[PDB]
Write a protein that binds this ligand. Structure first.
Ligand SMILES: Nc1nc2c(c(=O)[nH]1)N[C@H]1C(S)=C(S)[C@@H](COP(=O)(O)OP(=O)(O)OC[C@H]3O[C@@H](n4cnc5c(=O)[nH]c(N)nc54)[C@H](O)[C@@H]3O)O[C@H]1N2
Ligand SMILES: Nc1nc2c(c(=O)[nH]1)N[C@H]1C(S)=C(S)[C@@H](COP(=O)(O)OP(=O)(O)OC[C@H]3O[C@@H](n4cnc5c(=O)[nH]c(N)nc54)[C@H](O)[C@@H]3O)O[C@H]1N2
Ligand SMILES: Cc1cc2nc3c(=O)[nH]c(=O)nc-3n(C[C@H](O)[C@H](O)[C@H](O)COP(=O)(O)O)c2cc1C
Ligand code: SF4
Ligand code: SF4
Ligand code: SF4
Ligand code: SF4
Ligand code: FES
Ligand code: FES
Ligand SMILES: [W+6]
Lengths: 537, 775
C-alpha cells in the first residue's frame, strides 16, 4: 500500500532532541544522518518525514539531487564507512589523475574502503587534490594514501590564523561601530562605493552601489545571503582568504547588512571546504551579541547552487532548481522578500575602500582599464597560486611578471580564462587585456578570474570533452537544451571527428534557449575551438 | 493593453500570456509542456514555445510571460524556428519509432509534424525498463519528455503527494515513493496524470497489448456523469461496439476535469456477464420458476395488486422505493401509488441516514439544502469538519480543500476520534470519545456570547430565540467539559476565536454524526454557528453537510416521502390535498404513511399485504437479520425490480428487467443543489427496457391511463407543480448542460446561496433551538 512508518522511529527523536522542524531546515538533518551513520537509509527517511509531516516524494527528491547523500533501500547492499575521492577536472587531470584512479581502485578498493570520482574541490594549485574523509592531500600519490588510511587520519587538520583579539588590535571593528553610532552616516558609504567603481566580483560583472541602493529602496523586512560555493574549476581564492583573515569578511558583511537593514543573514559554502566550516564556527561564538544575528549552512555538490535562485531554493530547504529572470531576485528572494547576494571577496575589500578611499582604487590599473583584482593562476606555471594585480592586464605579463614563468621543459600553446564557462584561446590572442567587458567580442569572457595554461604536450579536444562531461554532470535537469544537448555533445565529441555544423546549430540553440546562465555557456569551448583552432580539422 | 505582434498593433486582455493571444487570434504555435486546460500552471521546461522581442538578447518563452506596454513579439523569424526544430530533433532522437509505439497518434507527434520533423540526426541513450505492477495503468516509461505534468496533476491538483523527479539531469526520471514499482505505492488510481502525459508512456491498459503499443482508436464518445457519488463528476465515456472502456473528465462546473478511481475504472458491473434479461419467478444463475414473457408476469402484478387491494383495502398495501439511478421515475413511482392505491404509504431507505439534519434545517429555516456549494471554499478563509472522510467517499471535494489550503493558506480544523489522512494538511486534530461532540460544541457555542464577541446586528433581526436560551447558556461554560470530551480548554477558546473572528467560514460533516440516536441533538446546536456570528448567506460563507448517493436530493425533493408530496408540501395540510387534485384528479388520504422501519415492524405480525419494491437491497441495508428473512417471509404477494438477483427478493414472486444506469436521458441532482442531465450510450441486452416504460405499462394495466410518453415530458409535468424549477426547461438542461434550480431569471447563471437577503420562511427569521445535554 505504501512505505510504512516502522518501529525504527526511536533513533530519530532521540537524535534531534530539541531542534526546529521547518521545511527550510532540512539539509542539516540529512548531513547529520550521513555523518553519524555512513549512509542514509529508507527507514530513517520515513521516520524523519512522518516527524516533519511530509511525503516520501519530497525527501526523496531532495536527498539525491546533491551528489553526496548516499541512499539505499531494504534491498541494496551496505555502504562502507570509509571513503575517498579524486579530482577529475582539467587541472587535476593534466597531472596524471585517471591513472591514479584506475591504479588504486584495485589495490585498496576493498569492502571496508571505497574510491569514487569528484569534479573539483578548490585545490587546482597543488595538482592532484585527493581527500580522505574530510582530510585533503597535496601532490597525492599511492604511497601517501596508504599511510593516510592505515592510520586513522580521516579527521581534518587545522592551521593557524588571526583571531578576534589580534584583529581588534588594529582597526578592529571600529569602522563598523562608527555606523551604529552616527559618527558617520550611510550615504558616504554608497558614495565611495559608487565613485570608486567597485564592479563586483563573481561571474556577473555588476556594480555594487546600485544593488545596495535598490535593495535599500524596497520595503518590508529585508534579508541577505552569501555564496561561498566557488565551484568553478579554476577558482581557489575563497579558501586562501577564509583561512587567513575571515574577520575582515565578517566586518564587510555586517557593514553591507546594517545599511540595508537586514535583521538576520545567511551563508552558504561547500562541503569540500571543511577547514573554514570549523574556523567560522570557532570565531562566530566569539563575535558578541550585537543585534544582527548570523547563520551558517552547508552544501552538498550541486554546482548549480553557485547560481542565485538555486541558492535561494536551497536555503529554503528545497530542490536546487533556478527560477526565471523576468521576475528579479532583489524584488523576491530567500522567503519571497528582497535580499542582496555578494561574494565573500566583494566584502573583503570594503574596509580598504573606506579607511583609505576611492583614489586608492584608481591609481592601480595598468592598461586603459582601471581597478584591482585577485587572479587565480593554475596549470603548467612555475609559481602557481592566487595573485593580486591591476586589472586590464595582459596574460603574457601575468605569466612572466607574477607567476615566475611557465616551466622548464614545456612551451605555451593555449590558455583559457573564465574557467570552464569561458573559452580556450591560443597564444596569438596574447595582447588582449583581461577585464569584464572586453572579451565578449571574442566569444568568451572572464567571470571568476580563473586562468589556466596548457602546453604543447597537452591536447585540447580532450580538455573540451572533460569540460562537457563536467557540464553534463553538473546540469540541474530542468531545461531541455542543457539536459539533452550536453549528452549529444559528450557523444558527438567522442568519435574520431565531429561535424562541427550540427554542433554550431546546437550551440546557437543552447545559447538562445536556456533558462539558466549555465546552458548559455556550455557551448563556448567547442565554438571557440571551431573558430580559433582551424588547424585541428 | 496595446502591443505589436508579427507586424500588427493588436490589443490583449490582462493575464493573457502571449500564447493565449495568438490562439485567440489564430497564430497557433507549439507548447508541448503547457496544458491550457483550467487548473494547471506553466513551468517553462520544454522551451518549444519561444519567440523574440525587441530589447532582450536571449530568446524568451510564450507560456510564462506577458505582453506589457510597448513590447513587440516576433514568431515568423529564423532564430525561433531553428531553436524549436532543434529541440524537437533532440526529443525525437531520444524517442522510439512512431510507426508502432505507445500512442502513435499523440500530442508530441502532432506538434512535431507541425514543425516539419520526421527523424533526427543525434543518437539514442539506452534508457531504462518498464514496470506494470499496477493493473490499470502501464508505465512503459521510455518516452518521458520531462514535461512535469504527472507532477502538477499529482502534486498540485489531485493532491496525494506521490510523484516526484528524484535524480539529476540525464538520469532525471519520474519515480513513485522510494523508487517503488507503483503497484503498491500510494497511487490511488486517480487518473489525472494518465490523461496529462502527452506521450503514451503514462498510459492505461485496454489501449495496448503485451508488445506494448496502441491497438485501438475511439469508436465513439458520449458525455455523462458518474453514478457512484453525490458530486456529479462529468465524464466522456469511451466506447467500442457493445463495449465500454475508459473515460476522461470534461469542463463541468461541478467537477473541473478531475475524477476518482471510479471515473476511470471499476464499471465492470454494467457489462458484467451474469445478469438478468427476463422474469424469473439460491445460486446466482436462475434455476426456478422462470417464464420469459411480458404480458403474463404483468397481469400477475396489475391484477394481483388490484385484487388484493379490493379484498384487503388500501392501507393494507405498502411500498418501498429507491433513488440510486433516476429522478423522473420517482415522480411517477409515487404518483402511481397515490393514484391507484390512494394511499401515502411511500418510503425511502436511502433518506434514512441524513434525516435529523433536514429535520433541524426545516425546524430552523424551512429548508434542507446545504447552504452553499463546496466548490466555493477557495474564496473563504477557514474550514470546519467533523465525522467524515471526504478523501474516500467524496474525494473531489477533499482535493478542492487541499488546493485551497495550498494556494490561499486558509486554515481548517478537524473533529474525529481516529486519525485521518488530511491530518498532514490539517491545522489541528481533536480526538474525543464518541457521543460527546455536543459538549465541546456548546463550549464553542457559549464561548462567543460569554466573553462578548458576537455580531449582535445579525442576531438583532435575523434569528429569534437569542435571549430565551441564555439561561442554560450562561449556566453552561466552555471550561468544564474536559473530562467529558477529552480535550483542553485553551484549544477551544482558540477555535472559537478563530471562527467568530474569521472573515468567513464553513462547516462540513456527514453520516458520522447523524448516525447516533440523537444526532439531531448534535446539529440542533451546530446549526447556529454561522447564524449567531453572521458568517452566512454571503460569499464564502455557509453550512454544507454531505450525502452518500447520487441524487437523494432529487428524490426526496420531488415527493418520495411518507409525509409530504414534492417540493416539501406536507400531506397533513388541507390545501395541498385541494390543488394537487386539479392535476391528478383523485381523492387522496390525509393521514401520513408508516415510515420505513415503522412499516417493516408493523407488517411483522401486522396487516400490510405485499408491495412494489425497486432499486434497493432492503434485506441487508438497515436491519441485520430479523427484518430480512422474516420480513418478507410472511408476505403474500411480492415484487422486485432489481437489476441483478440480489440477496433480497430471493422469493419475490415476480421480477422485471431493470435497466442499468448508462442507458437513459433525464435529470439527476447532486448534494450541491445542481441538476445534471444525462444521455444514453448503449442499449441493454435481452428484451429488457427502462423503468419509465415499465411503470407506464403497469399504470395502464391498473386503470390509470397516463400515456404521457417519454421523460422529456415527465420533466415538464413534474415542474408544473414544483416551483423550485419555476424557470427551467429540458432545452437548456441539454445546452449549457447542468444548472441549479433556485435560479429565478432565464438568461442568468443562477442563484446559488441560501439566505442572501432573508430566510424563505414565514417570519423571515429562524427559531434558534434549545440545545441541551439530553442523553
Ligand atoms: N465508498 C463509499 N462511499 C459512499 C458510500 C458507500 O457505501 N461507500 N455511501 C454513500 C452514503 S449516502 C453513505 S451510507 C456514506 C457513508 O460515509 P460517510 O459519510 O463518510 O460516513 P463514514 O464513512 O462512516 O465517515 C464518517 C466519519 O465520522 C467519523 N466518526 C466515527 N465515529 C464518530 C462519532 O461518534 N462522531 C463523529 N462526529 N464522527 C464520527 C468516522 O470515523 C469518519 O471519520 O458514504 C457515501 N459514499
Ligand atoms: N455493508 C454495509 N451495509 C450498509 C451500509 C454500509 O456502509 N455497509 N450502509 C447503509 C447505508 S447508509 C446505505 S447509504 C445503504 C445502501 O445500500 P443498498 O440499500 O444495498 O443500496 P445499493 O447498495 O446502492 O443497492 C442499490 C440497488 O439498486 C440497483 N441499481 C443500480 N443502479 C440502478 C438503476 O439505475 N436503476 C435501478 N432500478 N436499480 C439500480 C443495484 O444493483 C442494487 O440492486 O447501505 C446500508 N447498509
Ligand atoms: C550557472 C552559474 C553558476 C554560478 N556559480 C557561482 C559560484 O559558484 N560562486 C559565485 O560567487 N558566483 C557564481 N555565479 C554568479 C552569481 O551570479 C554570483 O554568485 C552573484 O551574482 C554574486 O553577485 P556579486 O557580483 O554582487 O558579488 C554563477 C552564475 C551562474 C549563471
Ligand atoms: S537546462 Fe541547463 S542551464 Fe537550464 S536549468 Fe537545466 S541545467 Fe540549468
Ligand atoms: S511521464 Fe509524461 S510528463 Fe512525465 S516526463 Fe514522461 S512524458 Fe513527460
Ligand atoms: S493516484 Fe492517480 S493522479 Fe495520483 S499519482 Fe496515482 S495515477 Fe496520478
Ligand atoms: S466523486 Fe463519485 S460521482 Fe464523482 S467522479 Fe468520484 S466516484 Fe464518480
Ligand atoms: S582540484 Fe582539479 S582543478 Fe580543482
Ligand atoms: S511551451 Fe510554454 S514554455 Fe514550454
Ligand atoms: W448512505
Amino acid at each position: 500500500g505504501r512505505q510504512v512508518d516502522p518501529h525504527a522511529k526511536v533513533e530519530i527523536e532521540e537524535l534531534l532532541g530539541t531542534r526546529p522542524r521547518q521545511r527550510d531546515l532540512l539539509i542539516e538533518h540529512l548531513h547529520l544522518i550521513q555523518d553519524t551513520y555512513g549512509q542514509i537509509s529508507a527507514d530513517h527517511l520515513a521516520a524523519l518525514a512522518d516527524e516533519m509531516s511530509l511525503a516520501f516524494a519530497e525527501v526523496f527528491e531532495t536527498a539525491t539531487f546533491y551528489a553526496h547523500f548516499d541512499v539505499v533501500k531494504e534491498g541494496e547492499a551496505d555502504i562502507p564507512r570509509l571513503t575517498i575521492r579524486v579530482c577529475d577536472s582539467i587541472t587535476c587531470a593534466m597531472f596524471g589523475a585517471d591513472e591514479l584512479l584506475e591504479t588504486l581502485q584495485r589495490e585498496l578498493a576493498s569492502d571496508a574502503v571505497r574510491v569514487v570520482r569528484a569534479p573539483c574541490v578548490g585545490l587546482c594549485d597543488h595538482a592532484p587534490a585527493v581527500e580522505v574523509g574530510h582530510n585533503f592531500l597535496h601532490r597525492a600519490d599511492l604511497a601517501s594514501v596508504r599511510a593516510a588510511v592505515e592510520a586513522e587520519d580521516t579527521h581534518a587538520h587545522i592551521p593557524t590564523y588571526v583571531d578576534y583579539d589580534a584583529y581588534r588590535a588594529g582597526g578592529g571593528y571600529a569602522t563598523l561601530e562608527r555606523l551604529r553610532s552616527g559618527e558617520l552616516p550611510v550615504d558616504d558609504v554608497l558614495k565611495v562605493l559608487d565613485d570608486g567603481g567597485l564592479r563586483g566580483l563573481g561571474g556577473a560583472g555588476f556594480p555594487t552601489g546600485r544593488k545596495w541602493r535598490s535593495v535599500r529602496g524596497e520595503p518590508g523586512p529585508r534579508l541577505m545571503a552569501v555564496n561561498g560555493d566557488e565551484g568553478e574549476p579554476g577558482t581557489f581564492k575563497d579558501q586562501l582568504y577564509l583561512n587567513t583573515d575571515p574577520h575582515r569578511f565578517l566586518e564587510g558583511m555586517l557593514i553591507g547588512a546594517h545599511v540595508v537593514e537586514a535583521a538576520d543573514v545567511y551563508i552558504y559554502l561547500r562541503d569540500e571546504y571543511p577547514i573554514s566550516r570549523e574556523i567560522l564556527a570557532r570565531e562566530i561564538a566569539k563575535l558578541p551579541e550585537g543585534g544582527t544575528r548570523i547563520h551558517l549552512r552547508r552544501g552538498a555538490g550541486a554546482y548549480i547552487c553557485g547560481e542565485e535562485s538555486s541558492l535561494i531554493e536551497s536555503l529554503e530547504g528545497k530542490r536546487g532548481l533556478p527560477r526565471h529572470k523576468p521576475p528579479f531576485p532583489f524584488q523576491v528572494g530567500l522567503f519571497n522578500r528582497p535580499t542582496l547576494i555578494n561574494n565573500i571577496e566583494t566584502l573583503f575589500w570594503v574596509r580598504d575602500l573606506i579607511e583609505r578611499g576611492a583614489e586608492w582604487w584608481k591609481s592601480h590599473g595598468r592598461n586603459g582599464r582601471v581597478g584591482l583584482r585577485s587572479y587565480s593562476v593554475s596549470g603548467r606555471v612555475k609559481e602557481p597560486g592566487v595573485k593580486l594585480a591591476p586589472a586590464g592586464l595582459t596574460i603574457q605579463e601575468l605569466i612572466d611578471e607574477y607567476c615566475g614563468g611557465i616551466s622548464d621543459g614545456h612551451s605555451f600553446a593555449a590558455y583559457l580564462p573564465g574557467g570552464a564557462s569561458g573559452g580556450i584561446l591560443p597564444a596569438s590572442m596574447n595582447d588582449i587585456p583581461l577585464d569584464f567587458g572586453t572579451l565578449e567580442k571574442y566569444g568568451c569572457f572572464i567571470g571568476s578570474a580563473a586562468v589556466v595554461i596548457l602546453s604543447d604536450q597537452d591536447d585540447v579536444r580532450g580538455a573540451a570533452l572533460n569540460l562537457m562531461k563536467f557540464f553534463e554532470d553538473e546540469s540541474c535537469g530542468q531545461c531541455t537544451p542543457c539536459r539533452s544537448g550536453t549528452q549529444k555533445a559528450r557523444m558527438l565529441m567522442e568519435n574520431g571527428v565531429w561535424d562541427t555544423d550540427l554542433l554550431g546549430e546546437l550551440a546557437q540553440c543552447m545559447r538562445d534557449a536556456s533558462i539558466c546562465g549555465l546552458g548559455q555557456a556550455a557551448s563556448n569551448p567547442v565554438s571557440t575551438v571551431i573558430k580559433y583552432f582551424p588547424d585541428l580539422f | 493593453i496595446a502591443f505589436e505582434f508579427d507586424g500588427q498593433q493588436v490589443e490583449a486582455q490582462p493575464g493573457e500570456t502571449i500564447w493565449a493571444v495568438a490562439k485567440r487570434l489564430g497564430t497557433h504555435i507549439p507548447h508541448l509542456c503547457h496544458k491550457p486546460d483550467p487548473g494547471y500552471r506553466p513551468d517553462g521546461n520544454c522551451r518549444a514555445c519561444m519567440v523574440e522581442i525587441e530589447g532582450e538578447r536571449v530568446l524568451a518563452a510564450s507560456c510564462k510571460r506577458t505582453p506589457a506596454i510597448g513590447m513587440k513579439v516576433k514568431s515568423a523569424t529564423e532564430r525561433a524556428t531553428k531553436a524549436r526544430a532543434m529541440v524537437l530533433e533532440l526529443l525525437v532522437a531520444d524517442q522510439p519509432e512512431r510507426a508502432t509505439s505507445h500512442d502513435p497518434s499523440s500530442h508530441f507527434w502532432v506538434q512535431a509534424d507541425v514543425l516539419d520533423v520526421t527523424e533526427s540526426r543525434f543518437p539514442a541513450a539506452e534508457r531504462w525498463t518498464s514496470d506494470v505492477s499496477h493493473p490499470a495503468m502501464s508505465v512503459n516509461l521510455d518516452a518521458c519528455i520531462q514535461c512535469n505534468l504527472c507532477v502538477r496533476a499529482c502534486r498540485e491538483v489531485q493532491v496525494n503527494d506521490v510523484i516526484g523527479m528524484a535524480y539529476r539531469a540525464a538520469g532525471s526520471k519520474v519515480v513513485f515513493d522510494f523508487d517503488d514499482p507503483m503497484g503498491g505505492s500510494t497511487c490511488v488510481a486517480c487518473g489525472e496524470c494518465v490523461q496529462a502525459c502527452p506521450t503514451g508512456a503514462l498510459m492505461p491498459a485496454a489501449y495496448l497489448d503485451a508488445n506494448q503499443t496502441r491497438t485501438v482508436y475511439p469508436d465513439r464518445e458520449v458525455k455523462s456523469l458518474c453514478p457512484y457519488c453525490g458530486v456529479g463528476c462529468q465524464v466522456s465515456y469511451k466506447v467500442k461496439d457493445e463495449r465500454i472502456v475508459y473515460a476522461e473528465g470534461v469542463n463541468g462546473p461541478a467537477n473541473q476535469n478531475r475524477l476518482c478511481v471510479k471515473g476511470r475504472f471499476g464499471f465492470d458491473y454494467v457489462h458484467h456477464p451474469h445478469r438478468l434479461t427476463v422474469p424469473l419467478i439460491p445460486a446466482n444463475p436462475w434455476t426456478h420458476f422462470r417464464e420469459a414473457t411480458w404480458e403474463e408476469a404483468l397481469d400477475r402484478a396489475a391484477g394481483g395488486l388490484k385484487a388484493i387491494r379490493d379484498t384487503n383495502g388500501r392501507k393494507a398495501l405498502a411500498g418501498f422505493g429507491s433513488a440510486k439511478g433516476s429522478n423522473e421515475e420517482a415522480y411517477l413511482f409515487q404518483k402511481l401509488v397515490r393514484l391507484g392505491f390512494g394511499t401515502n404509504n411511500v418510503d425511502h431507505c436511502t433518506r434514512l441516514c441524513h434525516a435529523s439534519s433536514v429535520a433541524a434545517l426545516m425546524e430552523g429555516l424551512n429548508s434542507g439544502a446545504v447552504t452553499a456549494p463546496f466548490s466555493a471554499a477557495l474564496d473563504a478563509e477557514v474550514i470546519v469538519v467533523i465525522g467524515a472522510n471526504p478523501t474516500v467517499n467524496h474525494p473531489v471535494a477533499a482535493t478542492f480543500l487541499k488546493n485551497a489550503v495550498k494556494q490561499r493558506g486558509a486554515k481548517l480544523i478537524i473533529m474525529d476520534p481516529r486519525r485521518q489522512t488530511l491530518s498532514r494538511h490539517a491545522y489541528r486534530h481533536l480526538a474525543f470519545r464518541p457521543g460527546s461532540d455536543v459538549a465541546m460544541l456548546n463550549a464553542m457555542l457559549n464561548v462567543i456570547v460569554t466573553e462578548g464577541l458576537y455580531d449582535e446586528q445579525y442576531i438583532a433581526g435575523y434569528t429569534e430565540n437569542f435571549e430565551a436560551l441564555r439561561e442554560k447558556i450562561v449556566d453552561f461554560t466552555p471550561e468544564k467539559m474536559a473530562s467529558v470530551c477529552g480535550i483542553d480548554a485553551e484549544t477551544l477558546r482558540e477555535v472559537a476565536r478563530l471562527y467568530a473572528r474569521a472573515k468567513s467560514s464553513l462547516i462540513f460533516w456527514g453520516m458520522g454524526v447523524s448516525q447516533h440516536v440523537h444526532g439531531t441533538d448534535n446539529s440542533r446546536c451546530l446549526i447556529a454557528l454561522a447564524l449567531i456570528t453572521g458568517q452566512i448567506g454571503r460569499p464564502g460563507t455557509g453550512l454544507h453537510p454531505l450525502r452518500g448517493q447520487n441524487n437523494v436530493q432529487g428524490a426526496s425533493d420531488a415527493g418520495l416521502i411518507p409525509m409530504v408530496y414534492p417540493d416539501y408540501q406536507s400531506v397533513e395540510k388541507d390545501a395541498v390535498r385541494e390543488l394537487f387534485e386539479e392535476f391528478w384528479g383523485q381523492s387522496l388520504d390525509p393521514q401520513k404513511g408508516l415510515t420505513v422501519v415503522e412499516i417493516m415492524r408493523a407488517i411483522h405480525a401486522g396487516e400490510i399485504r405485499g408491495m412494489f419494491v425497486e432499486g434497493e437491497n432492503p434485506a441487508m441495508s438497515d436491519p441485520d437479520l430479523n427484518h430480512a428473512r422474516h420480513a418478507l417471509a410472511m408476505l403474500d404477494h411480492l415484487v422486485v425490480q432489481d437489476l441483478f438477483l440480489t440477496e433480497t427478493a430471493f422469493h419475490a414472486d415476480v421480477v422485471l428487467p431493470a435497466s442499468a444506469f448508462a442507458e437513459k436521458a433525464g435529470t439527476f441532482t447532486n448534494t450541491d443543489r445542481r441538476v445534471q442531465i444525462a444521455q444514453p450510450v448503449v442499449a441493454p441486452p435481452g428484451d429488457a427496457r427502462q423503468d419509465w416504460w415499465i411503470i407506464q405499462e403497469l399504470a395502464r394495466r391498473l386503470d390509470l391511463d397516463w400515456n404521457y410518453g417519454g421523460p422529456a415530458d415527465i420533466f415538464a409535468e413534474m415542474a408544473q407543480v414544483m416551483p423550485s424549477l419555476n424557470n427551467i426547461t429540458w432545452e437548456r438542461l441539454e445546452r449549457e448542460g447542468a444548472v441549479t434550480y433556485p435560479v429565478d431569471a432565464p438568461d442568468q447563471p443562477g442563484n446559488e446561496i441560501i439566505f442572501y437577503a432573508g430566510f424563505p420562511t414565514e417570519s423571515g427569521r429562524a427559531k434558534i433551538v434549545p440545545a441541551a445535554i439530553v442523553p
